[PDB]
Amino acid sequence: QLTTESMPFNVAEGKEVLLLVHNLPQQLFGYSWYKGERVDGNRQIVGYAIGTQQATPGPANSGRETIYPNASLLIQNVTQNDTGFYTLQVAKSDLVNEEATGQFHVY
Amino acid sequence: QLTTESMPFNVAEGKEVLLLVHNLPQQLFGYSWYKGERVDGNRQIVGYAIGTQQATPGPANSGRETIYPNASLLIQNVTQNDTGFYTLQVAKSDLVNEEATGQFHVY
Ligand SMILES: CCCCCCCCO[C@@H]1O[C@H](CO)[C@@H](O)[C@H](O)[C@H]1O
Ligand SMILES: CCCCCCCCO[C@@H]1O[C@H](CO)[C@@H](O)[C@H](O)[C@H]1O
């Protein structure tokens, strides 16, 4: 149900990409974005909490990402390193969290 | 820092095992326990809120689990399908969460 997609799906090097997000839940505490295919705090880019509206970088944060209040993740001056899979956990207050994976390709 | 450890490490099928949890961070708002090596809501056993004490069964819930305020998980009438790996996510209120993976062996 929860999905993410990249606009565009194919991204020239050095140009922008937007990771969009769809079918969020009714009710969420916040979002966590991760590089690659699985939830892992060693590959966390950012945590975001809606109520205070508070982003915090994790270790995988490059400095070129911007998370928006609807979960969307912008990346500018994208690099070969950015290419491929991203992963998004929606955190809920009842601890039953939802997760999604998407990607884009760099050329 | 956050760790988990099985007691006992080897469990006779039909007996009990207790998953001890050490070094909870400060400023957390709940727990998730997942079956396996990875955080993944498809194999979740429970999400638990520490303020309200509500434990919510996930897909991987058997009925034999009991979860404590300090995050420890007891499992009773241990089957063979309970063997191996369990993974813990501590939900932090900055969403810069933490994870831990321990195991046990049935016989
Ligand atoms: C280039 C950066 C501009 C701002 C990025 C935020 C774009 C908004 O984001 C989009 O909004 C739509 C309606 O709210 C939703 O349907 C999409 O799923 C969502 O990701
Ligand atoms: C059947 C008994 C179940 C009661 C809950 C288990 C007791 C809580 O576990 C306690 O916390 C940590 C590991 O869990 C350690 O720091 C402590 O030694 C341990 O007593």
Numbering used by the authors:
A (entry chain B), B (entry chain A): 1 to 107
Give sentences from the paper.
Human CEACAM1 (hCEACAM1) is a single pass type I transmembrane protein expressed as 12 alternatively spliced isoforms that all contain an N-terminal V set fold of the immunoglobulin superfamily (IgV) ectodomain followed by up to three type 2 constant immunoglobulin (IgC2) ectodomains (A1, B, A2), a transmembrane sequence, and a signaling cytoplasmic domain. CEACAM1 function is triggered by intercellular or trans binding of the IgV domain, resulting in higher order surface CEACAM1 oligomerization and subsequent intracellular signal transduction. In contrast to other immunoreceptors such as the T cell inhibitory and mucin domain-containing protein 3 (TIM-3), programmed cell death protein 1 (PD-1), and programmed death-ligand 1 (PD-L1), CEACAM1 serves as its own primary ligand, owing to high affinity homophilic interactions of its unique IgV domain, as well as an important microbial receptor. The displaced CC′ loop forms a cleft with the FG loop that exposes the key residues F29, S32, Y34, V39, G41, Q44, Q89, I91, N97, and E99 critical in mediating homophilic CEACAM1 interactions.
The low resolution (3.1 Å) of the I91A mutant structure limits atomic level comparison with the WT homodimer and therefore provides a more global assessment on the structural properties of the I91 residue. The I91A IgV domain adopts a GFCC′-mediated homodimer with RMSD of 0.6 Å (over 1489 atoms) compared to the WT homodimer with fewer hydrogen bonded (12 vs 17 for I99A and WT, respectively) and weaker hydrophobic interactions (specially for residue F29).
